Every structure is written in C-alpha cells, then in structure tokens.
Amino acid sequence: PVTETVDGQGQAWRHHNGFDFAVIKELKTAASQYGATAPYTLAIVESVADNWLTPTDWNTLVRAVLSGGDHLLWKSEFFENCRDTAKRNQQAGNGWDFDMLTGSGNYSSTDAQMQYDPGLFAQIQAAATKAWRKLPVKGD
C-alpha cells in the first residue's frame, strides 16, 4: 500500500508501505472459502484498490491471495483491459495507460504511477478490480 503525505511547506510526497498481512490473509481466506465471485472477496479487491497501490504490491497481492484461477481471469483480463483502455486513451495521446496501466512495459515503473494522476489512478483502479474479480470456481 502507498500512503501520500504532505509536508507543511505544501509539498506532496508519498512512501511505500509494507503489504498488510491482515488484508492479504483475509482476502486469502475469502479466496479459499468464498471464491472470487462472492460479493465479499471482490468488495475487498476493489476496496484495497481504492487505496494507493502500485503494480509491485499489486502483483504480490494477487499472486498470494488467490491460487490458480487468479492469473487467468483477474490477470489475463487485466492485461487485456489495460491495453484495451490504452488503445482508446492513446488515440488521444494522453501519455498514460499503455505503459502506466499495466505495470510498466518500458518506463513509468512503480515510480511514475505512484506519483499518480487523477485520471490515471481512476483508470488503473477500475481496470484492476475489473480484472481482479472474474473467477468462476475455486478449489482443487
């Protein structure tokens, strides 16, 4: 998770924070129990994304909290919707989405995304949970 902090001189900055285990733990719980499709777990998926999050803690979150189905629906749709959105947004030539809303293909990395943009944060958040929901069945 990322928290942004402002200094008394009016500057905005932010720091990375460690992966909240309680969060991972219980999303893992709902994942095993509820399945990623039951309102509870995806409510958590989107609520966690409602916080400042980066591709780094993103990939760590998905890969831990779920097992098996995560990559296919959550993530493969992530990659699709990210570049889908990128196609639409870069028609306009925003300078977002293609590299940023993905993770970072070439340049933005954790850094530029973590500095955010109002339309970038909105787009990345929406795209994330969008992806990070679609699991049909869980269990092995």
Swiss-Prot record:
Highest taxon in the source lineage: Viruses
Cell location: Virion
Function (record text): Capsid protein.
Name of the protein in its database record: Capsid protein p27
Organism: Mason-Pfizer monkey virus (MPMV)
Residues of the full protein shown: 300 to 439 of 657
